Write a protein that binds this ligand. Structure first.
Ligand SMILES: Cc1cc2nc3c(=O)[nH]c(=O)nc-3n(C[C@H](O)[C@H](O)[C@H](O)COP(=O)(O)OP(=O)(O)OC[C@H]3O[C@@H](n4cnc5c(N)ncnc54)[C@H](O)[C@@H]3O)c2cc1C
Ligand SMILES: NC(=O)c1ccc[n+]([C@@H]2O[C@H](COP(=O)([O-])OP(=O)(O)OC[C@H]3O[C@@H](n4cnc5c(N)ncnc54)[C@H](OP(=O)(O)O)[C@@H]3O)[C@@H](O)[C@H]2O)c1
Ligand SMILES: NC(=O)c1ccc[n+]([C@@H]2O[C@H](COP(=O)([O-])OP(=O)(O)OC[C@H]3O[C@@H](n4cnc5c(N)ncnc54)[C@H](OP(=O)(O)O)[C@@H]3O)[C@@H](O)[C@H]2O)c1
Length: 531
């Protein structure tokens, strides 16, 4: 009653979808994919919150591997909403006959290596067991929900929603709603909620820096232009650092005139785009403290220009390093001018407890709500690995293997875990993610086909190669400001999670070259157990 398969894929987002296509169609392997989700989509299945939008531009937030698909797909606007991405991924699944290969509504709860037979034994929450030669983990770097336990929470008589588990069709129009969190998710859901809702209470702990998204309609002339030049657009993207489709600046910020610097930021501001403001503006906003301060200072002044009430402005003024994930919005600061929206500064004025009726802050004020929305983010990157029973050689648990910081070789493998691969695992690229996912999935499929064609029973990186990769990512990370940014990117967002590097910050171009060259070099750093 245990099922023998060549490959197990975990996840039905961009990663899993593509892994199943590659392993089944190109490699000719029996392949089973799993997701707890009732359908494919990953991020775009789960994040049904109002205002959910990509901030990779429409034409870049998709697969590139199928040139005809690129000519076929269409979009409304310069950025693309959750339902449109969801519809795009569903179509990819239909397009390549992938749906039959997935088990939806099914969580993998265990994956144990069997040393004697060189197989993985995988168990689901339903009690089915699979034996597989390969495991591809496409489990998401931003899917393990972080849901802080506030005092008194289970006392709340109203509805509780995490944004990354928003129920389909759930509308909060006409309700009294509080939001916890003002990262990329909070800004989007706040902006969307405010006109529809009776009252919106925002519990803001750290106000953030955000530029306009500049999400504009696209006419058939506009999509045409893009599509006719799609080959060159993708080559530029795959030859850049972050692949968002603007040219990345090398120009130091303090090298230029005080006025042009202002004009450059202003033209970036009016154009829109979060990554463009940080990197298509000057080449050292992320690397030079004065350059970063100039950027930060520019945004701060817009905030003081937007928010009318001096007190509300003070509470929402972003402070400190402009060194979290770059943000952009469709009118976020504007909403705090609306009479129905209330800002609560929870650093000055902490939450005392949640009650039946709402949230009491330490000033002793009850904030009456009947819905609480958690835009509190994720245990990022490693989170979904640590929540599962995964054991490699000699029963070594993932959590004992990664007893300190989580590690990889090349973002895609780890020692003592043979034939077990990761898509967007620890210490991989920090970019517009689809083309990074494509790079990793393609590389994993090539190494699996290699192993199949040769006599290979097990392939895993050496401890030395992994540690050298840790050192390479650490060196690169020290050269940027993200590390002093105090956010999820360096695992600083959950008390109890140890902070560390979690990304290779070299960019897509340098990453692709590393990946190409390790393969061209006979999988340098891997040990290969033959038949
Ligand atoms: C709101 C939001 C907006 C974003 N916007 C952008 C953007 O504009 N540009 C960009 O580049 N990136 C963006 N991202 C990041 C986004 O995660 C990626 O672009 C991409 O969708 C990741 O795809 P994935 O397949 O690797 O992971 P996911 O899409 O997260 O898929 C992982 C899947 O694995 C499943 N899973 C995990 N563990 C198990 C298990 N044990 N058993 C069964 N199933 C399991 C999960 O349920 C999930 O469906 C955004 C993320 C969010 C949350
Ligand atoms: N990727 C997401 O935003 C998301 C949302 C809900 C559930 N899930 C997946 O489904 C399973 C249960 O997750 P949960 O957060 O509901 O379980 P939980 O952590 O027990 O709550 C896990 O495999 C999880 O990764 C994913
Ligand atoms: N492209 C897009 O449009 C898009 C949209 C959504 C998400 N994303 C991706 O997902 C990443 C995560 O974004 P996110 O906004 O979902 O999560 P996030 O960036 O980690 O932000 C979470 C918010 O919740 C707050 N918070 C955490 N714990 C809290 C607690 N105990 N009490 C009160 N507040 C608490 C945080 O405050 P502190 O800052 O004080 O710690 C923060 O403001 C983003 O950086 C982005 O890369 C992208």
């Amino acid at each position: 009653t245990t099922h023998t398969v060549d490959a197990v894929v975990i996840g039905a987002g961009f990663g899993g979808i593509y892994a199943v296509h590659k392993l089944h169609h190109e490699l000719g392997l029996t392949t089973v994919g799993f997701d707890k989700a009732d359908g494919p989509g990953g991020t775009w299945y789960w994040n049904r919150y109002p205002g959910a939008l990509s901030d990779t531009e429409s034409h870049l937030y998709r697969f590139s591997f199928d040139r005809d698909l690129l000519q076929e797909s269409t979009w409304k606007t310069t950025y693309i909403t959750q339902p449109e991405i969801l519809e795009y991924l569903e179509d990819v699944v239909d397009r390549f006959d992938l749906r039959r290969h997935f088990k939806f509504g099914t969580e993998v709860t265990s994956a144990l290596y069997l040393d004697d037979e060189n197989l993985w034994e995988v168990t689901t929450d339903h009690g089915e067991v699979y034996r597989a030669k390969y495991v591809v983990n496409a489990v998401g770097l931003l899917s393990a929900i972080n849901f802080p336990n506030l005092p008194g929470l289970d006392t709340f008589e109203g509805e509780t929603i995490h944004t990354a588990a928003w129920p389909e069709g759930k509308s909060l129009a006409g309700r009294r709603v509080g939001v916890i969190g003002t990262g990329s998710t909070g800004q989007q859901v706040i902006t969307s909620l405010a006109p529809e809702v009776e009252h919106l209470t925002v519990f803001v702990r750290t106000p953030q820096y955000s530029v306009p998204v500049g999400n504009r309609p696209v006419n058939p002339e506009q999509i045409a232009e893009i599509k006719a030049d799609y080959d060159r657009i993708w080559e530029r993207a795959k030859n850049s650092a972050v692949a968002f489709g603007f040219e990345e600046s090398t120009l130091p910020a303090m090298s230029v005139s005080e006025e042009e610097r202002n004009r450059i930021f202003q033209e970036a501001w009016d154009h829109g785009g979060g990554f463009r403001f940080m990197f298509g503006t000057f080449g050292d906003i992320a690397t030079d403290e004065a350059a970063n301060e100039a950027a930060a200072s520019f945004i701060r002044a817009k905030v003081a220009e937007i928010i009318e009430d001096p007190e509300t402005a003070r509470k929402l003024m972003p402070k400190g390093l402009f060194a979290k994930r770059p943000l952009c919005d469709s009118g976020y600061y504007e909403v705090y001018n609306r009479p129905n929206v209330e800002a609560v500064a929870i650093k000055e004025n902490p939450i005392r407890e949640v009650t039946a009726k709402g949230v009491v802050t330490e000033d002793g004020v009850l904030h009456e709500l009947d819905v609480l929305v958690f835009a509190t983010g994720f245990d990022a990157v490693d989170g979904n690995y640590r929540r599962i029973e995964i054991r490699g050689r000699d029963g070594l648990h993932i959590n004992d293997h990664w007893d300190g910081q989580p590690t990889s070789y090349l973002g895609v493998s780890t020692a003592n875990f043979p034939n077990w691969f990761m898509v967007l695992g620890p210490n991989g690229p920090f970019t517009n993610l689809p083309p990074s996912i494509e790079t990793q999935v393609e590389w994993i499929s090539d190494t699996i086909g290699y192993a199949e064609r040769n006599g290979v029973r097990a392939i895993e990186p050496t401890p030395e190669a992994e540690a050298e990769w840790t050192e390479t990512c650490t060196e690169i990370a020290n050269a940027t400001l993200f590390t002093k940014g105090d956010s999820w990117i360096f695992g600083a967002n959950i008390p109890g999670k140890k902070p560390s590097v979690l990304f290779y910050l070299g960019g897509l171009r340098n990453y692709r070259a590393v990946m190409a060259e390790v393969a061209a070099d006979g999988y340098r750093g891997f040990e290969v157990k033959s038949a």
